[PDB]
Amino acid sequence: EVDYSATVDQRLPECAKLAKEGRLQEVIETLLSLEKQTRTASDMVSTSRILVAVVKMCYEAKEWDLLNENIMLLSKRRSQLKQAVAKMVQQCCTYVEEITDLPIKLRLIDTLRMVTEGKIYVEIERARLTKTLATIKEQNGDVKEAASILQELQVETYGSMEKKERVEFILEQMRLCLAVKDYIRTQIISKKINTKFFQEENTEKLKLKYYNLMIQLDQHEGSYLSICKHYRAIYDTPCIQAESEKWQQALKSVVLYVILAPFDNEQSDLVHRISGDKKLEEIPKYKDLLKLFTTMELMRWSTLVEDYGMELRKGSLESPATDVFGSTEEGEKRWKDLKNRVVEHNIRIMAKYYTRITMKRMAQLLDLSVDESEAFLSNLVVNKTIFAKVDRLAGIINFQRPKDPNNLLNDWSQKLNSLMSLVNKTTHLIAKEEMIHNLQ
């Protein structure tokens, strides 16, 4: 309420001179006196300039203990203005960026965190310093501690911190969580990001980071359709689509995973949408795979392995392979998965037609011995996938639901009604033709 600008501006040069000369104590004491006077006067700017002056002087003294103590005392100075504390903290943050000594860095960062715990006026800085400390504990080969220190920060809440830093902080959290080999926390952390944010002005590197972290997440237990969705989003990214190799690999992954997916309405609609992709021509064998999985006709595993066996698993120099079916353990798992999907599509296709099919003939056509085909059918039925009754005593597999008389008569009625409508339509076409040819 009472100006002190002239006093502080005059004094400060002398204080810096005396400090650099070696009069640190006297200059610090006089600065504390001016700070108390100003703060009782409630001068935010003068207090901030004085506080920054003190923090700067002390650092060019190798007085780590003196610097940290002075930071503490300044923070707890009574009636201390929040803006002054924030400026002092941003200075300390720059400095923590500068300093290099491992113990000095760690101690200064801890002091900055303690003075920076729980305060809006300094809230960005806390997240930044926590990110720095998580980095430091991470490249020291300690991952759990990095994960905890990072997860302790609730980025979303901060209303001042800009969006891009929020997303980058979340993404660091997710990468660390995947590293620590825990996933449930990752699912929890994923929903917190907004997928719509990755459309606004520039979110290109962050977008690819998010989608790669998911694809690594969903491969853990198997969510092939979700992974196809994410690869598709990556393919839609302009940067990937601009270069040939990037978008071609995007489509390779998307088609292979839609293939690997469990059959259902969503996967059917997705495969139908992907199939009508003019760019798909570039990948000949892969579009062959797509059609084969959309055409309704039995397919033999033998033919698929003989033709596309090498183009998928062992890769091609002209057409790059993908980690989808590499030699890793997950490669064998997904190869089993593709076997499973061909078998299930075969079962469904004969499950549209084929009211009855002897167990031996189904097993022969599916390329399995009797027992394994029977087990596969039993599991499918128990899971509600398809409907069928195995008459193990006679070796028959009936695909027909019961026909209650109510349904039988209802079908009869639908048939009559369609007959009536076709009679009406044929009469309309007759009237039209007679009009076109009879007036003459």
Partner: protein
């Protein structure tokens, strides 16, 4: 022409937008009270093959009487959130109206609308506005209030034990009610809502601070232990003033000092009897 069962003016809770927003989990403790209020408006609704095997006639309504601020209108609010039956809410100060024959008309209209919808709850908050024992039947106004009260009794006694219309009313002074309400057949349960004891104080603190940031430093056992007769509404002002101070100092965490100041703010201790007694 004969119209649908009720034109009515006592609109019934839309149970769509006007449904309150207090879950059973917002409350803490009052397990016994929850039981009785639910056990008295649901247990007769279920079964009934066991409520005339032991000859005890089923309850008609519930009186909820307790000190001023221990959760009387909270529980009604929750049982209005969760319950599936129709809900009609009134305040006894609303029946009393200017013209003669209008108070009785409103009472009859309310109970008739309830009877129309088999599952229904009628809540009459602050029944003290009507059922006051003492009367001065010499001024008319008191005569009309007595008329409303008698109409309530006559409507309550007009049931067949086979209609699922229940009534619950809350009062801050049960003793001031007339006995005609307490007689069996009418209101058959009284549910005390006493000031919290230690265990309830702990539960309500935990449940009300559960939404806080509440750094781990704070040890609520200290606040609950204090031998201070505090009502549940206060236990929410301590937890609110704590965060208030937090925001005053521009934080988003609550320290032990903040809570201490809150408790010293909300519980001002009575004028210490000069210590030359004792």
């Amino acid at each position: 022409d004969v119209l649908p069962p009720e034109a009515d003016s006592s609109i019934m809770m839309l149970t769509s937008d006007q449904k309150p927003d207090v879950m059973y989990a917002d409350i803490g403790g009052m397990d016994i009270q929850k039981q009785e209020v639910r056990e008295a408006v649901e247990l007769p609704l279920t079964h009934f093959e066991l409520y005339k095997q032991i000859g005890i006639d089923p309850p008609r309504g519930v009186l909820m009487y307790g000190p001023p601020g221990c959760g009387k209108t909270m529980l009604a609010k929750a049982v209005a959130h969760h319950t599936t039956a129709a809900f009609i809410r009134v305040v006894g100060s609303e029946f009393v109206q200017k013209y003669l024959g209008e108070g009785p008309r409103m009472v009859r209209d309310v109970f008739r609308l309830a009877k129309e919808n088999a599952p229904a709850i009628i809540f009459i908050d602050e029944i003290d506005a009507i059922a006051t024992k003492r009367f001065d039947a010499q001024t008319g106004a008191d005569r009309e209030v007595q008329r409303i009260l008698l109409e309530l009794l006559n409507q309550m006694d007009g049931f067949d034990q086979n209609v699922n219309v229940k009534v619950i009313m809350a009062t801050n002074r049960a003793d001031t009610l007339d006995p005609a309400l307490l007689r069996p057949g009418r209101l058959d349960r009284k549910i005390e809502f006493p000031l919290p004891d230690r265990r309830q104080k702990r539960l309500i603190f935990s449940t009300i601070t559960s939404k806080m940031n509440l750094s781990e430093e704070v040890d609520l056992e200290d606040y609950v232990a204090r031998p201070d007769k505090i009502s549940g509404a206060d236990i929410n002002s301590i937890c609110q003033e704590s965060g208030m101070l937090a925001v005053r100092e521009n934080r988003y965490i609550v320290l032990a000092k903040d809570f201490e100041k809150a408790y010293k703010t909300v519980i001002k201790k009575d004028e210490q009897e000069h210590e030359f007694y004792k």
